[PDB]
Amino acid sequence: GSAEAGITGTWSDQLGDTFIVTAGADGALTGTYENAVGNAESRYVLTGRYDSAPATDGSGTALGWTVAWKNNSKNAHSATTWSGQYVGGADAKINTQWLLTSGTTNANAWKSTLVGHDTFTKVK
Amino acid sequence: GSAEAGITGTWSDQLGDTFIVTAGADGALTGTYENAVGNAESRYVLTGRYDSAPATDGSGTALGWTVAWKNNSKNAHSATTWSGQYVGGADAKINTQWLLTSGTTNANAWKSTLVGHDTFTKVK
Amino acid sequence: GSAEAGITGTWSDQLGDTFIVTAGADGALTGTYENAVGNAESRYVLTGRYDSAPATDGSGTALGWTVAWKNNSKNAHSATTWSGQYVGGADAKINTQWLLTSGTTNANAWKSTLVGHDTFTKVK
Amino acid sequence: GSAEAGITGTWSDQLGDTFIVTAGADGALTGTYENAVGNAESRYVLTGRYDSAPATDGSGTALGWTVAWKNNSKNAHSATTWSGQYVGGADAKINTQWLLTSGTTNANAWKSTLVGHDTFTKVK
């Protein structure tokens, strides 16, 4: 599909971290998040969902994914979810907003969740 | 693990919608979101990640998941991501914030993304 | 006006912190945020805006306000904005979501902004 | 004050809308939001707060403000709060995230609040 092939590939965010994703025919997203320096200890699994049959009116394709910040050697006791849309074309983009929740005590729950935005450009 | 068994089960949000989840040993979350009514036409796949080795200091367990709002009969061209933490105990909860992005044109992208919060209570 | 009178007063959030607000005919909000303790060195100025002529169809009244966390005795180099709606009736509420930005270096800007939610009830 | 002078002026967002603001010695912000096309019917009051004594370690200056979308000619029954930081130097910016709540019925409250982000550049 157009949505499937568009989303699949390697993306870089504006901080230079790297989002490697495959989109499946069933709406699944799978891949890896890794840091700008490329470090093996810097790689984390991601999973999410996308709209496999987007509107045909020039709108983007909705999607979201999660990374929990645990891998074989690190654990930051936190997870980020990216919610956004894929916009195809020459200079395709994925435009997202994100929520990063850390595990906290209930007294510190008000400081549990960061918010931000990341824009990805496709490298290949 | 305590994280794995705690998260697994059926949760209800404060709108009365139903979140059925299984947590795996590898950090995966899988399940289904359904409406308060119960309807098969109301059921959607979810996927996400959690911290499978949370801190042992009374903090919650970080997690996130995504639903793309396409099933076999409906497509709302959108996806929600929930970011939050599981808090165990007798009165266990999953406390979350969410981002719901719709596919839009670039001109309407400023109105693409809703934000909110959902608190879940475990029913089984 | 109905919106003016319903918003004006003293409000408590679910953390037990105190919000004293006056709404003006021109859509201005002014007041003070104070801690759950009561402390005079924990009082900060608030300013904001509300819809002085809301819909009469059962909809809430849109509003927002800002606290910068500097007073004569303390400076936490940060500001919170609450965005939400006032809902009148028997047990009137202000339901909000908030963003708290701390001043940071560009390198730490991804850690600059917390998000959360506060529900206020009016104190008699 | 450096923060007072830096913040005071006319700013344009990435959508080309115009924010005219004055920062006062007491931490107050006041001004006007205006649309990309300049329209006097499209001007709305803003009020907010900023940290009048920011850190001098390279950190930005925290601030926030609100616009309620009512003026003499229009009422969109909603309000936006911007939360962010001013970053000085040669290429000065205000980086923000925002929440836009519309007045809704309780049934529709999950669709009440949009979130996004706006970066401003100074015009003069």
Swiss-Prot record, chains A, B, C, D:
It comes from the Bacteria. A motif (Cell attachment site) lies at residues 49-51. Keywords: Biotin, Secreted, Signal. GO terms for molecular function: biotin binding. Its main location: secreted. The keyword Signal applies. Residues 3-124 form the Avidin-like domain. Coiled coil: none annotated. Belongs to the avidin/streptavidin family. Homotetramer. It comes from Streptomyces avidinii. The biological function of streptavidin is not known. Forms a strong non-covalent specific complex with biotin (one molecule of biotin per subunit of streptavidin). Biotin binds at Y33, Y44, W82, W98, W110. It is found in: Secreted. One of its GO terms (cellular component) is extracellular region. This is Streptavidin.
